[PDB]
Amino acid sequence: SLSDESFEFDVSVIGLGAMGTIMAQVLLKQGKRVAIWNRSPGKAAALVAAGAHLCESVKAALSASPATIFVLLDNHATHEVLGMPGVARALAHRTIVDYTTNAQDEGLALQGLVNQAGGHYVKGMIVAYPRNVGHRESHSIHTGDREAFEQHRALLEGLAGHTVFLPWDEALAFATVLHAHAFAAMVTFFEAVGAGDRFGLPVSKTARLLLETSRFFVADALEEAVRRLETQDFKGDQARLDVHADAFAHIAQSLHAQGVWTPVFDAVCQVVQRAAAMGYGDQDIAATTKSFARE
Amino acid sequence: SLSDESFEFDVSVIGLGAMGTIMAQVLLKQGKRVAIWNRSPGKAAALVAAGAHLCESVKAALSASPATIFVLLDNHATHEVLGMPGVARALAHRTIVDYTTNAQDEGLALQGLVNQAGGHYVKGMIVAYPRNVGHRESHSIHTGDREAFEQHRALLEGLAGHTVFLPWDEALAFATVLHAHAFAAMVTFFEAVGAGDRFGLPVSKTARLLLETSRFFVADALEEAVRRLETQDFKGDQARLDVHADAFAHIAQSLHAQGVWTPVFDAVCQVVQRAAAMGYGDQDIAATTKSFA
Lengths: 295, 293
Description:
Chain A is α/β, with parallel strands linked by helices.
């Protein structure tokens, strides 16, 4: 900020594959002065046409802006970029925001490297498909250097309207279980729709009805489960676990009689039957949560 | 206009356990004139105080209103009611809306029995917990007698603001797949929160964050999937099945490493891998759907 006059750019983006390309476009559309570097003729040309400044090198892109967003093929690609001529020197006093998919140990080594050079390392996860980068309702998770993340938070909010910083080990864990739920929820939908087909319900009319008829019920059920988990109130006043176990077995049986393969639903039945066998039968269905506990 | 039959009530409710009680309560609150009957006069007490009329018998309840809602303990309870004195005759020219959960082919017999007596049978499935009976956004499914359903649709919309009639075959099959998804999606959430707890993330903050952070992503992804399934467009332009399989493997690897039990996610992985093995890898993730055909 004392450095504001020194920078002709707000942000640099390195790597212009689909995700990096959309991030750069969104940021240009929002009015940021964006500098880029890549190895991609197609991708760099459209971005230049849209107002991005093409830099001659990684080191120039790092120098051009107070933060550089990295979106690269893999960890090998990240280290290669960082090893290039004069890059170490150009990291000093810059924040790297790393959206590249990474193994858990690898991030700490990258953080170390960037820090060793006097830069700041932020790891980002964007909970969105490229089409929703920049969306007011999209979410991201960031970890690494809290101070650098706060410095650049408004910028990064350009990529996903809602963001949260968590410390390293919580961020990775949270992203893991968040994506397990989000992707599993999608697949339960594919499985039920596919199962509809075996009943003679065509996927093309049934999918929209299935979504529209379940939307409120599921959302209201999850919201209520959260309220109970927060209050630790598992009273079986409304939705007994054992009653659900009964219902689930009935559903699984009609599915089996029709000859449908529903491994996800079978697994769901396994979980709740087991919670029932563990003493949770007379509690609210949200007590299923506790059946996973170590204690 | 030929009939000109006089009713002092809009609806009768037989069965005053939890679901019947709430349905009667909601209908009274909306201003319906409601007649009730229960094997135990006890549970009618609050309903009577609320303004329900207590009928002497099932026969009187059936005669009192143009349609009678049945919400009984089980299929045996329904037959026991229908075999009580004079009930057969009192079925004639009445609509029975049966929300009692039973097994298929029970329903068909119930239907037959009611139709034989000159009555009209409508089966109902309400996709709600009791707390959301009456809710404008609650949904119900109906089948049986289409004509009778349409006759009483506005009354049945008192219980769930959105309703759909499907023919017998479709209705029950649709209810089954709808609940399979709905209940499985809930359990995926419990499994993920439980997993979080084993990473040291407190349930007290994590459940809320998990819901809030995934809501839009999931809802948008399901909307897009439906668009694709309607339009038969499986091009791998935005969300490749193969890239998802890699992503899911990595998630499974972190879960299995922390030593958490995630049987539902495990099964999800198994589904997607299979779809990749079947050659859908380059297709949109919604192609997963086809792997079940």
